[PDB]
Every structure is written in structure tokens, then in C-alpha cells.
Motif scaffolding. Structure first.
Motif, PDB file in Angstrom:
ATOM      1  N   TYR A   1      66.496 -71.480  50.286  1.00  0.00           N
ATOM      2  CA  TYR A   1      65.427 -70.495  50.358  1.00  0.00           C
ATOM      3  C   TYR A   1      65.012 -70.097  48.955  1.00  0.00           C
ATOM      4  O   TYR A   1      65.857 -69.906  48.080  1.00  0.00           O
TER       5      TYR A   1
ATOM      6  N   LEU B   1      74.158 -60.773  31.862  1.00  0.00           N
ATOM      7  CA  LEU B   1      72.896 -61.492  31.942  1.00  0.00           C
ATOM      8  C   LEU B   1      72.229 -61.578  30.573  1.00  0.00           C
ATOM      9  O   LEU B   1      72.208 -60.611  29.808  1.00  0.00           O
TER      10      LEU B   1
ATOM     11  N   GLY C   1      70.265 -66.732  40.945  1.00  0.00           N
ATOM     12  CA  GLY C   1      71.283 -65.903  41.555  1.00  0.00           C
ATOM     13  C   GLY C   1      71.985 -66.669  42.653  1.00  0.00           C
ATOM     14  O   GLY C   1      72.613 -66.082  43.535  1.00  0.00           O
TER      15      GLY C   1
ATOM     16  N   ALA D   1      67.607 -48.775  32.090  1.00  0.00           N
ATOM     17  CA  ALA D   1      67.183 -48.091  33.304  1.00  0.00           C
ATOM     18  C   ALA D   1      65.791 -47.491  33.156  1.00  0.00           C
ATOM     19  O   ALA D   1      65.112 -47.251  34.159  1.00  0.00           O
TER      20      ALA D   1
ATOM     21  N   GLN E   1      58.338 -50.937  38.087  1.00  0.00           N
ATOM     22  CA  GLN E   1      57.917 -50.666  39.457  1.00  0.00           C
ATOM     23  C   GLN E   1      56.701 -49.753  39.496  1.00  0.00           C
ATOM     24  O   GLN E   1      55.847 -49.887  40.378  1.00  0.00           O
TER      25      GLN E   1
ATOM     26  N   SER F   1      74.194 -66.154  47.560  1.00  0.00           N
ATOM     27  CA  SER F   1      73.288 -65.332  48.342  1.00  0.00           C
ATOM     28  C   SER F   1      72.375 -66.215  49.181  1.00  0.00           C
ATOM     29  O   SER F   1      71.988 -67.308  48.771  1.00  0.00           O
ATOM     30  N   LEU F   2      72.033 -65.732  50.372  1.00  0.00           N
ATOM     31  CA  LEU F   2      71.158 -66.510  51.240  1.00  0.00           C
ATOM     32  C   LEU F   2      69.719 -66.444  50.746  1.00  0.00           C
ATOM     33  O   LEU F   2      69.135 -67.465  50.373  1.00  0.00           O
ATOM     34  N   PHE F   3      69.143 -65.244  50.722  1.00  0.00           N
ATOM     35  CA  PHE F   3      67.862 -64.986  50.081  1.00  0.00           C
ATOM     36  C   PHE F   3      67.796 -63.512  49.716  1.00  0.00           C
ATOM     37  O   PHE F   3      68.618 -62.710  50.154  1.00  0.00           O
ATOM     38  N   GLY F   4      66.827 -63.156  48.883  1.00  0.00           N
ATOM     39  CA  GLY F   4      66.730 -61.789  48.403  1.00  0.00           C
ATOM     40  C   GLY F   4      65.481 -61.605  47.571  1.00  0.00           C
ATOM     41  O   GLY F   4      64.717 -62.545  47.341  1.00  0.00           O
ATOM     42  N   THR F   5      65.287 -60.368  47.111  1.00  0.00           N
ATOM     43  CA  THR F   5      64.084 -59.995  46.381  1.00  0.00           C
ATOM     44  C   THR F   5      64.400 -59.797  44.911  1.00  0.00           C
ATOM     45  O   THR F   5      65.228 -58.934  44.584  1.00  0.00           O
ATOM     46  N   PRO F   6      63.777 -60.534  43.998  1.00  0.00           N
ATOM     47  CA  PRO F   6      64.000 -60.306  42.568  1.00  0.00           C
ATOM     48  C   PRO F   6      63.077 -59.226  42.009  1.00  0.00           C
ATOM     49  O   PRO F   6      62.273 -58.628  42.719  1.00  0.00           O
ATOM     50  N   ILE F   7      63.216 -58.978  40.706  1.00  0.00           N
ATOM     51  CA  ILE F   7      62.494 -57.920  39.998  1.00  0.00           C
ATOM     52  C   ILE F   7      61.741 -58.535  38.820  1.00  0.00           C
ATOM     53  O   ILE F   7      62.264 -59.417  38.133  1.00  0.00           O
TER      54      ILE F   7
ATOM     55  N   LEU G   1      63.273 -50.420  33.614  1.00  0.00           N
ATOM     56  CA  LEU G   1      63.334 -50.941  34.972  1.00  0.00           C
ATOM     57  C   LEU G   1      62.422 -50.159  35.905  1.00  0.00           C
ATOM     58  O   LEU G   1      61.755 -50.735  36.770  1.00  0.00           O
ATOM     59  N   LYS G   2      62.378 -48.839  35.739  1.00  0.00           N
ATOM     60  CA  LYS G   2      61.514 -48.011  36.563  1.00  0.00           C
ATOM     61  C   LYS G   2      60.055 -48.097  36.130  1.00  0.00           C
ATOM     62  O   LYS G   2      59.161 -47.883  36.958  1.00  0.00           O
TER      63      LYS G   2
END
Lengths: 234, 226, 226, 234
Positions: free
Chosen positions: A199, A109, A156, A17, A24, A161-167, A20-21
Motif C-alpha cells: 500500500y 530520523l 516507514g 514541535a 498543518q 505498518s500496513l498503511f498510514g498518513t504521512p506529514i 510541525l504545527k
């Protein structure tokens, strides 16, 4: 009845954690989307999956088409391969391509690295994923081959999932996120057909990569999956 | 700007600087909900004196998915670096009235049905409309539905209510061509979104969560089964 | 004939000489139950290790109708000439095994779903099959389902279990031509019967009771609504 | 939570349950069924309901067609009109016809009697049911006009039962039970049409009425509802 109980988190989850921050607060992440038609990949897997198993003893999947098309796009635009180190405020180019592949096993993962993707074909990539998939499954996967990646594929899409935002994996500058394959109506040639489409998403660092360079990058991955004969041409 | 708007903008930036928010999308076919509302809306009004809406189908399907995966119900408190599980489900419902946004809480959603949820939303909707809505019943929620779909947005990214870990955002219903059974029909479909904390919730657990909400709205008889 | 068969024939004639039994019939369309069993039978077996049958749809719809009209739940005791209401629902299920008929009791049906009912029937079906079925859990039922439809009877009249006031009799499923929407389709339909005590239950209350069981099997989403 | 509470039943409900069991222990009840096609009654109500309301200020219903057809069948076979009195072991014939009509109001069931049905028409029956329906609704319904009936119609079909078995009013020998009207496919003329049909039932005393006389009785009620012009003929 209103019951709540405090279970603690260990010191390993503390650092996960924490990293991860930091990913960003370092880089300015944006996301761009597109859409790939998966028809030429499935009939490649429809007729050649039997001669592939007899001659190599491997399974022919979707994953090796995205790894080989990603090494094609990175060697054309080297700025996506770059990394900004804020220690000396430097821009570190690289001349090698190491694509990290997130393969979600039962345990969780894991993100091992495929080394030197520039010289391989579909047969070499499929050997590397299969035997290293068996290593992390029975937990013999070393630490020394989990770092140094320059680009990351994130499947993923095995859950729907349809679509999404990775990191972004923080020593890198971009990440590709593939998703589920659905049959949707498509306007092709002025007529409405039904074709399996995916997508895709690309999360990029806007400090380094331009807004038009990320669009051209993801458009180049699409051309090498809608027609995989471009890998032999330009 | 007054001192009240000072704190609202202050709490909003603390929600981004605390948790690592990501967003995932999916798509729900709303055909089995509308014909449920097409034939039973008259016997519902005569027997309960209430209106049969879309909102109670999303609240009951959300309590179903949360009691299967309790990790979405959890909250990380960074005071003692703790992971606080909960055993109760309190879904906050953002109901935008003329005055503005208000977020009251529906308490103990595990035992209710569609008739109980519709009573709770209707009479509490009248409280906040004439401004008698107390402070003590606006906090302690564990999950949040956000109807921004009464204005006609296609899809978008919501923002996490900071004592929680996830939020569901429903949107507008449009008729789009759909490939079903190898043929191209036209069916009313909705895009949904789920903004989750990536410090706590895994990337595959958020996909499985939103896929479970879809199964209980595309076919609401799963609430009686598994 | 032995002394056990003496008492069985003795209790049987006391059930006719006590209460004034009548019978009323209706007809249920079993289309929404079969396609529920057509698509969800595979995810039910993987997740619960059970079989999805017709029986759990009739037990859950029977507890729904009894909690709306409590007079069918009542019993007249002729000791003090009293009317004994009850607030719990215990449905007895006649499950004909190879040995013969047995009538065990499912306790507290009000809080269950289809998954809980299917566990109760399956493991207790194994108990009476190998003859470990106790006496203490065969009495105190308030309502009775009678599956005489696994042999292929069209319709018929059942007999009241004497500490109760009503009994439901389900029957065989046949494909018959049906006038639906002004057209003649073929749909699988079942005749059902309800034998009731006319000393206690009115003639119009028995019709409304069996009409309510039909609405919760022709459309099982009413269990979530009214 | 297992709660049960004993509420008592009053002395009026004592006698109702007492008379009910005496009706079963006296006479040997059997039941026979048939099926009536309700097409000629509905188009009679489709075109004449407007001139009936203007000229009589009444509503034209199904009930008056069953009461007039019941007085027709009883005056042909007087044995259904009879009553066995077990005081002197006697068979009491009657020459008058008084049909009791169970009209379930909000309060509950009431069974008033229509007197001397032999001379009436549909207009006279509709007056008798309508004004006496208003009497029992506001509870001014006397006791002296609830007894002495010789035959009983039981409309349990305003709730939607398919078919069922009624119970004999104990000073009588038979009872007719009408039911709900549904549209079912019908083989007429070698073709499959859809016509609104009703199941009817007749519970009779087998001590007095023969098994073949009950079938002929219910078959005669059917002929005067499938074609109501027989009331002018034979």
C-alpha cells in the motif's frame, strides 16, 4: 503507587514541535491511497543482484525503484513540483527535481536530499544513498544539504505498518509514503493467486493540487513500478 | 443547542488545534482469541459469574505495550512546556450505552488479569446504565480504547481524548481470505487504528507500538514471556 | 561412611516414620508447551539472553494450584500438634548437577512470570555448580519439584522433603499413541506423580490438585483466566 | 509479605491421624495393578437403563458391578477374607462377606458397610447404596453400621485420577481402588481399536496374603467385569 515526574524538553524540541504545527495550519492536507504489485521488482533483484555487486560494489534495493519512478512522474505534471509562497501570494514553479529521502538510522530520523534526479539511473541513485547513509551514521552530515527538497519519500515500511498518513515537509507540496510488503491473495485473470503487494499513500496540498491530479500522479508511480520498462518508453 | 453542548464542541476543536494528529493502521488475526472463548466460556461463567468477551484481551495487551515504551504514556503540558512522564497505567474504556457515550477509567491495569478486568467493566457498566456514574472517576486516563466495532465499521480515524497522547480504535470482525503458508484460507480478521501525537511520539515508535499490541492478541502467551 | 552420610540416612527414615505417604499419578500432553518453545525461543534469547525450557512451565503452574488450595501449603508440627498455614509460596527445585543433588529455593513465586523464573534458576544454577551455594537459601521451602526425567524414567515414586507436605515428580517425555477425537494420533506425553501426606491432605484433594496442574500445562492460557 | 498463622487441630483429627499411622506400622502393605476393559458394562447400561428405572425406580451405575464381582472373588479365596489379630497372634477366618463402600459426599468421606453380599443381585445392591447414600447426606448415619467390614471399594475415580495407591482400612487385609475411565488405543485381535479402559489397584497385607494370591485375586475381579456372565457359571 502513583508517581509522575516532570522532565523538561530542550529548545531544539521546542522548534520541531513549532514547525510541525505550522505545516498543518498553512496547507489543507488530504490523503489518497493505491496499491502496487511488487513482482517485477523482486525478480529483477533476484537475478541481477550478483552482477550488480561484482560490477558496482553496491546492494540492489527497493528504494532506488521508487526514487527513479518519482522523478518520472514529477516531470510530467509540474504542478506537483510547485510551491505556494504566501509572502507575495505567489506560485513558484521549479525546473529541477530534488527528492528528499528519509533514512531512519539508529540515532533517529534524518532527511538528506538527492540532487538532480532527472539524469540518473539506478546505479547513480544507489551510490548517492549508500555513501550519504554512511555520513549521517557517524554524524558528519552537514546542514547545507538538508534543505531545498521538492518531494519526499518516507520509508516507514521497514517496521511493518500496513498503511498510514504521512506529514508534509513544510517547504514542499506533496509526500509519498511507502509501506510494508505482505503476501495477500489477488484476483488476477479471474483466478486467485498470492502476490507480494504494497500500500502507498500520497499526502497533498489541496490549495494547489487538484483532487484528480493527485490520483493521476499516484497512478503514474504505480505504472513505473509494476512495469519498470515504461521509463524507457513514454 | 444547550450550554453543555457548547463546551463539548469547544473541547473538541481544542484537541485538534493543540496536537498534530496522525493515524497508522494494521491488521490482527482473531483466531486464537475465539477458540479461547470457545472452550473456556463455560468454566468461566460457573466460577466467576461473568461473560468472556473480546474487550479484556485488548485492555491487557494495551497495558503490556505501554509499560515497554513509556513515551506513549507521556503528556506534553504547554503551560511550562514540560514533558510529564507517568508510572501508572489507567486505560479509559468508551462503552456506548443506550443513553450515549461514556468514558470511565480502569485504574491500575498493571497488576490485573482477565478476571479482574472483567469484574471492573461489568459492574461499572451497570452504574452508567442506570445513571449513577460519578464525575470523579471519568478523568485522569492515560490511554483510550474505542470500540466502534459493535456497529460494523471497516476502519476509520478516531479522535484523541485531549489530556492523553494516543488512542486505539478497534473495529468489526469479518471473514476475509488470507494467504497463510502459501495457501488461501479464510480467517476472522480485524483492522485497528492508532491516532498519535506527532509532537511527542516518533513516526517509528507508533508503528512499533501497534505491532506489539498485535503480537499479544495473535498469541496471548507472550504476556507470560517477554 | 562419614558422619555427614549418617545424618542424611537419619533424616530420610524420619520422613517415613512421621507422615503417612501415598502416591497418585496422571498424564500430561506436552504439545502446547513445545510449539511455544518452537517459535518463541529465538526472540526470548535475543531479548533476555536465556534459554527457554520446560522447567519454568511447571514452577508457574505449581504456584497457581497452591494458591487455590491452601491445605497443600500447610504443615503439621507435632510439637504442639498444630496445623501451620502459610501465605507465601517457596518452591524448591532439585537441580542435579555433576557434583550431586542440590535443592535450592525459589522465593515468592506468586508475582513472577516465565522471565523471572528463568533468571532465578539460571544464575543460581551457576552458583551451585562452582560450589558457592549458601546454606541459608536451602531451607524453608513449601513445595518441591523433582526432575528425575533428564535420565529417562517412565514413572516412579518420590520422597517428601520432611519440612513439607507434598512433592511433584516429573518424568521423561515419550511419543505414545493417543486416542484423541476418536482417532489414534501420536503425541508427546509425560507421566507425573504426587506424593502427599494423608494425615493432612484428603484423598480427593490430592487428585484435584494434580488435575489442576495438568490444566495449566495442557493449556497455559488458564493462568490469565480463572 | 511473609505471613503464617497457627490454627489448631481438634481432638477428633488427633485420633484419625493416629489410626492412620498405626495401619502402616502394623501390616506390610504392597500394591499390584491391572487393567479392565469396560465395554460389556456400558452397553449393559445402554439398553437396560430404561427398563431398570421403570421397574425399580433406581439408577444403573458402575458401582454395583464391582461390588458383586468382589463378593465372587472373596468366596473363592478365603485367605483374603482373613485377618491377623496380633493380640493372641491368631488368624481369624470369616464366613460372611461385608464390603465397605467409600461414598464421598459433599461433607467428606464416609465408609458405610453393605451386609451379607453373598445372596444379593444388582437390584439388591442398588437399593442398599441409594437409600444409605441419602442417610449420610443429611447426617443421620449411625456409628453401629460403619464397622466390621471385611473388604473395601474406594471410588477415587469420580475426580479423574489415572491410577494410585490406596490405604488399608486397619481392621481389614485388602482394599480395591477403582479409577477413571478413559478412551485409549487397544491392540485387540491384531488391530488397534479404541476402547474405554480402567486401571485398578489392590493394596494387600504381605504378612498374610502371598504375592501370587494377590495377582490371582485381582485377575478374577477382571474376569467378572470384562464378562459378567461368569457369575452364573464357575
Amino acid at each position: 503507587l502513583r508517581a509522575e515526574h516532570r522532565e523538561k524538553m530542550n529548545r531544539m524540541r521546542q522548534r520541531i514541535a513549532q514547525r510541525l504545527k505550522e505545516a498543518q495550519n498553512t496547507c489543507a492536507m488530504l490523503t489518497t491511497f493505491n496499491e502496487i504489485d511488487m513482482s517485477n521488482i523482486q525478480d529483477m533483484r533476484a537475478r541481477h543482484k550478483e552482477a550488480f555487486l561484482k560490477k558496482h560494489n553496491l546492494k540492489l534495493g527497493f528504494m532506488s525503484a521508487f526514487v527513479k519512478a518519482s522523478a518520472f512522474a514529477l516531470q510530467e505534471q509540474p504542478v506537483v513540483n510547485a510551491v505556494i509562497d504566501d509572502t507575495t501570494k505567489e506560485v513558484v514553479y521549479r525546473d529541477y527535481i530534488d527528492i528528499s529521502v528519509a533514512v531512519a538510522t539508529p540515532r533517529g530520523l534524518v532527511v538528506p536530499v538527492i540532487r538532480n534526479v532527472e539524469t540518473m539511473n539506478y546505479a547513480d541513485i544507489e551510490r548517492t544513498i549508500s555513501e550519504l547513509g554512511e555520513k549521517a551514521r557517524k554524524n558528519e552530515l552537514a546542514i547545507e544539504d538538508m534543505d531545498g527538497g521538492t518531494f519526499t519519500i518516507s520509508n516507514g515500511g521497514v517496521f511493518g505498518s500496513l498503511f498510514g498518513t504521512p506529514i508534509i515537509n513544510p517547504p514542499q507540496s506533496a509526500i509519498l509514503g511507502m509501506h510494508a510488503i505482505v503476501d495477500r491473495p489477488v484476483a488476477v485473470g479471474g483466478k486467485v493467486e498470492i502476490r507480494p503487494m504494497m500500500y502507498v499513500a500520497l499526502t497533498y496540498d489541496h490549495r494547489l493540487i487538484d483532487g484528480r491530479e493527485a490520483v493521476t500522479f499516484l497512478r503514474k508511480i504505480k505504472a513505473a513500478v509494476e512495469d519498470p520498462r515504461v521509463l524507457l518508453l513514454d
